[PDB]
Design a protein around this ligand. Sequence first.
Ligand code: ADK
Ligand code: ZN
Length: 187
Amino acid sequence: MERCGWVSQDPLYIAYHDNEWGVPETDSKKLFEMICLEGQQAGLSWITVLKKRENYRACFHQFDPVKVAAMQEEDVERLVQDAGIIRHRGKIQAIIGNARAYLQMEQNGEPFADFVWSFVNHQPQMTQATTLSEIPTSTPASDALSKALKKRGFKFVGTTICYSFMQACGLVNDHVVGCCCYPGNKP
Ligand SMILES: Cn1cnc(N)c2ncnc1-2
Ligand SMILES: [Zn+2]
């Protein structure tokens, strides 16, 4: 039985595959971090951002979305030189805007995980696909997620962004069915 296609690609994916390929329930806090790195995969590769995730968290190690809304262009100007993360003040400015949207949901008292888990009916989704090509990049819950986050002023939420986010968050199980031991049979 084979595990995952991008897993045999290199040890870095093996760590991410074993760290949490959507197996644990997600918290509203991690939901914000995931949509942040997940948004960068637009046109870019997930591994390209993965390396930047290590450097990016180093500078953004504040894990405090409120301060992120306080991070202005002056901060992105110096950060492009901090560790040499993905130099791109433009896309980084979008990240700061994402924080203001985070406060918008809080002003509404609605946690990110609350409405997301609600889209999947607070229940896990079993994918009957067999290969990555058989994996859907646009599901009703993923499509509903992008339009919803887009309304909150959340940028970088393409249809693949919503689907890729649920894939690793834990809302759905769909590596490719048969990934070494895909659950959902008798468990
Ligand atoms: C291969 N892969 C794994 N995890 C994610 N979150 C991804 N987003 C795009 N591609 C991804
Ligand atoms: Zn897998």
